[PDB]
């Protein structure tokens, strides 16, 4: 997901602006749905919601727009159990042997004969939660096992939380409402209001451990791998209880990152750290936010947002619709030099020509260079010390950069990676004349619609994930509900699309109508006022009661 909130100091009109570009699945239980909800006099909110929820999840109202991105905070902890040396179904806490609890569930299964059979399954549970196994990493042997405590299992406030956000007036009110209830399960929140405030909040449900407990309570090797794992054999490693928290064992709102500014805030799924580099967010628990190198989407956004230039709605829209493959800018100049150094190398000819001709985009008409680039980067990511300038914490926006072709072993490995990538591309069943939009599609009935964008891991702000199906790359997730909101005098002006269209049903008039528009990158008005709604020539009305 991407989000950018712009405040009065940078917006062209001196008022707030919000770009919402969540990246979510195109099918299933997390497929966005547009709607506008009104209880006249007390609720008037429009946006998109997730299946089965009678609230708006990402939206706007008269003076406010908000969105979410998936955060980097822990929302659970693993607990490594020390098993009773005499009994692998018992575990030790402060040296005392405790029994696992067993919960059986029964499931009905339809067989080959069409009849139901009953299957029973035993779920083992500790005081922390159920046991989990990842074969070869988190095993259950005679020495250890792993349990998982999910902080959101006790979060009964989630629906009330979005309903409250739906009633929020401005940025200040939204902050009070979120900090008061702490019902947000696993996302950041970013917002802008008419008055020109830009807000970032890493305000979600996060397991709490007091600072002094973390060094001894962590499983060092698992935490270094980004897994929130704690010592389950010590009672002192229980989540800390702070009476200021809305829920026992979670982090109080005052200890979670918030940034309120009048220029901009941004997030593309990295930690709170570089939300705005002019004011870094530091000093938080490793369970909350760490100073980790930012991904290429945030690096791209910051390269566009930094400075003193006015930010217009057009600026933010085009950051999505440009389909710039930002990861190319760290490596392609050197890759092209390598190509020119190897003009007598037949295994490289087609790859080098494609890379040279390529517009550095993931547009419909972007050439096969993008495909060669993707296969190359997959291999480049596996090479050791190939960066000319490795990541520099002092230069966190401009590093890593370049390929270290002046090191003979790197030059060799990079050329080999390019040759192997080329072999893989040419081994597939695509002509070099085919362009990106000929390959990446969304199927609608027996038809296919060409889809622009590319994987977020390649720094494409318009992130699109696709999987091989038949002869094409079928879109499975990414840019979904798009909302760009400004606040002119008449009322909020919202512009965007739902990329996969309102209906998942092929029979619907609304199965592919916005997908055609997404293909052409033609965003539309999201009508909110009665005037805007009444002006729509397609307007239909039904009143229902029982």
């Amino acid at each position: 997901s991407n989000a950018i909130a712009v405040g009065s100091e940078r917006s062209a009109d001196g008022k707030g602006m919000l770009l919402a570009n969540p990246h979510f699945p195109w099918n299933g239980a997390m497929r966005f749905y547009q709607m506008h909800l009104t209880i006249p006099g007390r609720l008037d909110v429009m946006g998109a919601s997730l299946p089965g929820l009678p609230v708006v999840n990402i939206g706007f109202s008269r003076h406010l727009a908000w969105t979410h991105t998936v955060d980097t905070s822990s929302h659970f902890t693993l607990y490594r159990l020390a098993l009773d040396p005499k009994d692998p179904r018992r575990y030790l806490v402060d040296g005392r042997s405790l029994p696992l609890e067993e919960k059986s569930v029964a499931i009905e299964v339809r067989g080959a004969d069409g009849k139901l059979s009953r299957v029973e399954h035993k779920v083992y549970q500790s005081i922390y939660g159920p046991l989990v196994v990842w074969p070869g990493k988190l095993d259950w042997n005679r020495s250890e096992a792993y349990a998982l405590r999910d902080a959101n299992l006790e979060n009964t406030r989630v629906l009330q939380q979005w309903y409250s956000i739906n009633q929020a007036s401005d940025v200040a009110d939204l902050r009070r409402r979120v900090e008061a209830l702490q019902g947000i399960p696993w996302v950041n929140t970013l917002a802008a209001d008419e008055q020109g405030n830009a807000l970032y909040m890493n305000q979600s449900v996060v397991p709490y451990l007091k600072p002094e407990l973390i060094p001894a309570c962590a499983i060092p090797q698992l935490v270094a791998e980004g897994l929130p794992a704690l010592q389950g054999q010590d009672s002192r490693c229980a989540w800390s209880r702070d009476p200021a928290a809305a829920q026992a064992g979670i982090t109080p709102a005052a200890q979670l990152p918030v940034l309120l500014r009048r220029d901009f805030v941004q997030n593309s799924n990295d930690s709170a750290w570089l939300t705005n580099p002019a004011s870094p967010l530091q000093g938080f628990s490793p369970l909350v936010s760490q100073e980790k190198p930012i991904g290429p989407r945030a690096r791209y956004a910051l390269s566009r947002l930094q400075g003193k230039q006015p930010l217009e709605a057009k600026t933010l829209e085009e950051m999505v619709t440009a389909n710039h493959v930002f990861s190319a800018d760290q490596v392609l100049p050197d890759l092209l030099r390598l190509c020119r150094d190897n003009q007598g190398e037949k295994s490289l000819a087609r790859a080098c020509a494609a890379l040279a001709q390529w517009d550095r985009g993931a547009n419909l008409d972007s050439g096969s260079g993008f495909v060669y680039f993707q296969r190359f980067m997959q291999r480049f990511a596996e090479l050791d010390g190939a960066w000319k300038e490795p990541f520099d914490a002092q230069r966190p926006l401009d590093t890593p950069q370049g390929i270290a072709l002046d090191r003979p072993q790197v030059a060799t490995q990079v050329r080999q990676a390019l040759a192997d990538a080329a072999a893989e591309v040419e081994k597939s069943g695509i002509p070099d004349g085919a362009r990106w939009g000929d390959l990446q599609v969304s199927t609608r009935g027996q038809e296919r619609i060409a889809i622009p964008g590319g994987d977020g891991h390649f720094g494409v702000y318009n992130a699109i994930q696709s999987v091989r199906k038949g002869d094409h790359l079928e879109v499975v997730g990414g840019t979904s509900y798009i909302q760009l909101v400004t606040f002119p005098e008449e009322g909020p002006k919202a512009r965007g699309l739902l990329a996969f269209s309102q209906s998942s049903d092929p029979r619907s008039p609304h199965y592919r109508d916005q997908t055609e528009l997404f293909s052409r990158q033609q965003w539309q008005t999201l009508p909110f006022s009665d005037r805007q709604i009444d002006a729509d020539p397609q307007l239909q009305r039904l009143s229902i009661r029982e």
Partner: protein, 164 residues
């Protein structure tokens, strides 16, 4: 009863629901959603109820790409009666009303559906929903940042045998 909504649709089938209260608001939401996505919601409710294997057998997967039986075990464990009850009891009156309305509105569409926008018409798993089904969906979403990511891992967890 006491359920009423006014729905306006603009271009691309975007609904604008107006009501005097939460029950009425949920009524409009559930009805509009069902018009567009009845089959989707029915399928995902089957998943959240842990009934995939019952309707579809063991060879199928959920839309999360989990095998049907492991998915069912996980959701039966997650959405036990006691857990749903406790969750419901902790809801504000306003939220309970939104959910009651939503179920009723979805069900209204199902009663009148003739296949115009519903491709799964006649399937045994396309059926009237309860507020508990919406709680099942909510809890499924809630754990997507936690134990839901370990669904296969939870199902796989068994004590060691006699092995060296």
């Amino acid at each position: 009863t006491g359920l009423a909504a006014d729905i306006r649709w603009t271009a691309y089938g975007v609904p604008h629901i107006r009501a005097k209260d939460e029950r009425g608001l949920g009524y409009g939401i559930g009805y509009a959603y069902a018009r567009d996505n009845a089959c989707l919601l029915a399928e995902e409710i089957v998943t959240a109820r842990g009934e995939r294997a019952r309707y579809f057998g063991s060879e199928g997967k959920s839309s999360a790409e989990l095998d049907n039986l492991p998915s069912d075990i996980f959701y039966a464990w997650l959405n036990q009666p006691e857990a749903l009850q406790a969750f419901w009891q902790a809801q504000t009156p306003a939220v309970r009303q939104l959910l009651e309305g939503y179920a009723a509105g979805f069900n209204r569409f199902l009663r009148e559906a003739d296949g115009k926008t519903t491709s799964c018409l006649g399937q045994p798993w396309l059926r009237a929903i309860a507020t508990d089904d919406l709680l099942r969906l909510t809890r499924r979403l809630l754990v997507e940042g936690g134990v839901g990511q370990f669904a296969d891992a939870l199902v796989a967890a068994a004590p060691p045998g006699a092995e060296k």
